[PDB]
Design an enzyme around this catalytic site. Structure first.
Site, PDB file in Angstrom:
ATOM      1  N   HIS A  79       0.819  -1.217   0.000  1.00 49.75           N
ATOM      2  CA  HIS A  79       0.000   0.000   0.000  1.00 49.75           C
ATOM      3  C   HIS A  79       0.865   1.286   0.000  1.00 49.75           C
ATOM      4  CE1 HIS A  79      -3.218  -2.867   1.208  1.00 49.75           C
ATOM      5  NE2 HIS A  79      -3.875  -2.163   0.291  1.00 49.75           N
ATOM      6  N   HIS A  83       1.235   1.782  -5.720  1.00 53.16           N
ATOM      7  CA  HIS A  83      -0.133   1.303  -5.735  1.00 53.16           C
ATOM      8  C   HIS A  83      -1.108   2.430  -6.062  1.00 53.16           C
ATOM      9  CE1 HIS A  83      -3.725  -0.819  -4.752  1.00 53.16           C
ATOM     10  NE2 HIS A  83      -4.010   0.003  -3.739  1.00 53.16           N
ATOM     11  N   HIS A 117      -6.595   7.239  -2.385  1.00 56.15           N
ATOM     12  CA  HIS A 117      -7.367   6.171  -1.750  1.00 56.15           C
ATOM     13  C   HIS A 117      -6.661   5.361  -0.643  1.00 56.15           C
ATOM     14  CE1 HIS A 117      -5.497   3.126  -4.196  1.00 56.15           C
ATOM     15  NE2 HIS A 117      -6.142   2.188  -3.524  1.00 56.15           N
ATOM     16  N   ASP A 118      -5.325   5.242  -0.623  1.00 51.23           N
ATOM     17  CA  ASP A 118      -4.633   4.512   0.447  1.00 51.23           C
ATOM     18  C   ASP A 118      -3.655   5.397   1.250  1.00 51.23           C
ATOM     19  OD1 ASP A 118      -5.713   1.888   0.707  1.00 51.23           O
ATOM     20  OD2 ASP A 118      -4.680   1.271  -1.128  1.00 51.23           O
ATOM     21  N   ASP A 228      -8.781  -0.896  -7.670  1.00 50.40           N
ATOM     22  CA  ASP A 228      -8.024  -1.324  -6.501  1.00 50.40           C
ATOM     23  C   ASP A 228      -7.373  -2.702  -6.671  1.00 50.40           C
ATOM     24  OD1 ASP A 228      -6.924  -0.772  -4.081  1.00 50.40           O
ATOM     25  OD2 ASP A 228      -8.782  -0.949  -2.925  1.00 50.40           O
ATOM     26  N   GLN A 280      -4.732 -17.660  -3.877  1.00 51.62           N
ATOM     27  CA  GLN A 280      -4.923 -16.813  -5.059  1.00 51.62           C
ATOM     28  C   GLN A 280      -6.081 -17.326  -5.940  1.00 51.62           C
ATOM     29  OE1 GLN A 280      -3.105 -13.927  -6.472  1.00 51.62           O
ATOM     30  NE2 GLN A 280      -2.927 -13.794  -4.258  1.00 51.62           N
TER      31      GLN A 280
HETATM   32  C1  LIG Z   1      -2.161  -6.296   1.317  1.00 52.15           C
HETATM   33  C2  LIG Z   1      -3.561  -6.304   0.851  1.00 52.15           C
HETATM   34  N1  LIG Z   1      -4.607  -5.937   1.556  1.00 52.15           N
HETATM   35  C3  LIG Z   1      -5.749  -6.061   0.813  1.00 52.15           C
HETATM   36  C4  LIG Z   1      -7.035  -5.709   1.452  1.00 52.15           C
HETATM   37  C5  LIG Z   1      -5.582  -6.530  -0.473  1.00 52.15           C
HETATM   38  C6  LIG Z   1      -6.620  -6.801  -1.508  1.00 52.15           C
HETATM   39  N2  LIG Z   1      -6.219  -7.019  -2.888  1.00 52.15           N
HETATM   40  C7  LIG Z   1      -5.730  -8.326  -3.145  1.00 52.15           C
HETATM   41  N3  LIG Z   1      -5.782  -9.288  -2.219  1.00 52.15           N
HETATM   42  C8  LIG Z   1      -5.275 -10.484  -2.508  1.00 52.15           C
HETATM   43  O1  LIG Z   1      -5.412 -11.347  -1.436  1.00 52.15           O
HETATM   44  C9  LIG Z   1      -4.985 -12.659  -1.774  1.00 52.15           C
HETATM   45  C10 LIG Z   1      -5.005 -13.431  -0.467  1.00 52.15           C
HETATM   46  C11 LIG Z   1      -5.717 -14.746  -0.698  1.00 52.15           C
HETATM   47  C12 LIG Z   1      -5.240 -15.815   0.233  1.00 52.15           C
HETATM   48  C13 LIG Z   1      -6.190 -16.445   1.012  1.00 52.15           C
HETATM   49  C14 LIG Z   1      -5.785 -17.440   1.871  1.00 52.15           C
HETATM   50  C15 LIG Z   1      -4.448 -17.769   1.908  1.00 52.15           C
HETATM   51  C16 LIG Z   1      -4.048 -18.775   2.750  1.00 52.15           C
HETATM   52  C17 LIG Z   1      -2.711 -19.113   2.810  1.00 52.15           C
HETATM   53  C18 LIG Z   1      -1.794 -18.435   2.041  1.00 52.15           C
HETATM   54  C19 LIG Z   1      -2.218 -17.449   1.180  1.00 52.15           C
HETATM   55  C20 LIG Z   1      -3.547 -17.100   1.090  1.00 52.15           C
HETATM   56  N4  LIG Z   1      -3.931 -16.120   0.257  1.00 52.15           N
HETATM   57  N5  LIG Z   1      -4.705 -10.865  -3.652  1.00 52.15           N
HETATM   58  C21 LIG Z   1      -4.704  -9.874  -4.549  1.00 52.15           C
HETATM   59 CL1  LIG Z   1      -3.985 -10.273  -6.040  1.00 52.15          CL
HETATM   60  C22 LIG Z   1      -5.182  -8.596  -4.372  1.00 52.15           C
HETATM   61  C23 LIG Z   1      -5.094  -7.576  -5.454  1.00 52.15           C
HETATM   62  S1  LIG Z   1      -3.911  -6.811  -0.745  1.00 52.15           S
HETATM   63 MG   LIG Z   2      -7.278   0.641   1.073  1.00 53.66          MG
HETATM   64 ZN   LIG Z   3      -5.729   0.160  -2.523  1.00 50.49          ZN
END
Ligand SMILES: Cc1nc(C)c(CNc2nc(OCCCc3ccc4ccccc4n3)nc(Cl)c2C)s1
Ligand SMILES: [Mg+2]
Ligand SMILES: [Zn+2]
Length: 322
Positions: A79, A83, A117-118, A228, A280
């Site tokens: 963030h 970003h 926004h962040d 976002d 992912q």
């Molecule tokens: C630092 C951030 N704060 C927010 C609110 C963000 C939101 N935006 C994204 N969030 C994710 O979250 C992916 C995690 C999914 C996940 C579930 C469970 C798991 C369990 C074990 C290991 C990994 C695991 N990953 N991926 C992408 Cl590509 C984006 C753009 S980033």
């Molecule tokens: Mg935010």
């Molecule tokens: Zn953001």
């Protein structure tokens, strides 16, 4: 209390001109700002000028604003400043492709909201701040960080020669500040699920009316979520490197919880690294795909974002299968 840029920072930005090789690729949805760090402030000015025009904001005030926004972004793994510009570029691409649907007031509000926004993100989730009773959670009960981002945006505007919206009438100024507020709050992912659900219903029943202000705010909300999350819409090598940044921030948050004797969820546990590809795939399936699917329904020219999102999803499946 806010951090302001130095005269030399904003005067330097005033000069900068974008290289002609980028003129065509900046227009594309999959464009990556990543390899052009020193140009990012200049890219934002370029987008404001190409979209809105060269005289939408007094160049001085705009360069002061941008450089002060950059200063109020921390050195967190995800963030950060990078970003902010990535999100604003996705908004720029959306606005350019849907040139007859938004007002001049919306077009300038949304570009600013995306850059801010962040603002002043500490690299911690709303859950962390709330659980460990951080001063910010005591200040803003819900959408903790998002409220702070809009507060940091207002405080920056209120600095000496930073009010880019000073030339607007009292009515138009309150209007743009409202668009910004709502747009920044919409970036609280917790709010997205309900917003997209409501929009899908309005679209399916044929009751979605762009004339209705509440309906408009919802579409803008989804556009903010779509921007976002846009790292999932870049080319695979860019997407893959941004995921490393996202997890570096998640893991640093979990390291903090561990230091306090609190077991973080797998997503924030660096010892649960092997689960990232599956993590992912679930994120793409439950969040990203529905997001771009509904966005493409409301705004058909945003279809390349859904297409790129689907390409990265199959890449993640490939990683899971080896
Ligand atoms: C630092 C951030 N704060 C927010 C609110 C963000 C939101 N935006 C994204 N969030 C994710 O979250 C992916 C995690 C999914 C996940 C579930 C469970 C798991 C369990 C074990 C290991 C990994 C695991 N990953 N991926 C992408 Cl590509 C984006 C753009 S980033
Ligand atoms: Mg935010
Ligand atoms: Zn953001």
């Amino acid at each position: 209390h806010m951090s302001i840029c130095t005269s030399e920072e904003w005067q330097g930005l005033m000069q900068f001109t974008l290289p002609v090789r980028l003129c065509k690729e900046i227009e594309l949805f999959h464009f990556d700002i990543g390899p052009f760090e020193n140009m990012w402030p200049g890219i934002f000015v370029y987008m404001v000028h190409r979209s809105c025009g060269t005289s939408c904001f007094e160049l001085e005030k705009l360069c002061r604003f941008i450089m002060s926004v950059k200063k109020n972004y921390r050195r967190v793994p995800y963030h950060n400043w990078k970003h902010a510009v990535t999100v604003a570029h996705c908004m720029y691409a959306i606005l350019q492709n849907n040139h007859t649907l938004f007002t001049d007031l919306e077009r300038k509000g949304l570009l600013i909201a995306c850059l801010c926004h962040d603002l002043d993100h500490r690299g911690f989730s709303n859950s962390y701040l709330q659980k460990f009773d951080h001063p910010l959670a005591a200040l803003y009960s819900t959408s903790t960080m998002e409220q702070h981002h809009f507060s940091q945006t207002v405080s920056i505007l209120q600095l000496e020669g930073h009010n880019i919206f000073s030339t607007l009438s009292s009515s138009e100024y309150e209007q743009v500040l409202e668009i910004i507020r709502k747009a920044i709050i919409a970036t609280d992912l917790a709010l997205y699920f309900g917003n997209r659900k409501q929009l899908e219903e309005m679209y399916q029943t044929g009751s979605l009316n762009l004339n209705n202000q509440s309906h408009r705010d919802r579409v803008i909300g989804l556009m903010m979520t779509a921007c976002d999350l846009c790292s999932v819409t870049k080319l695979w090598p860019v997407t893959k490197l941004t995921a490393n940044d996202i997890y570096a921030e998640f893991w640093a948050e979990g390291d903090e919880m561990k230091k306090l004797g609190i077991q973080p969820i797998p997503m924030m546990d660096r010892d649960k690294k092997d689960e990232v590809p599956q993590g992912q795939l679930g994120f793409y399936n439950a969040v990203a795909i529905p997001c771009y699917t509904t966005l493409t329904q409301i705004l058909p020219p945003t279809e390349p974002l859904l297409k790129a999102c689907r390409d990265n999803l199959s890449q993640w499946e490939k990683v899971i299968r080896g």
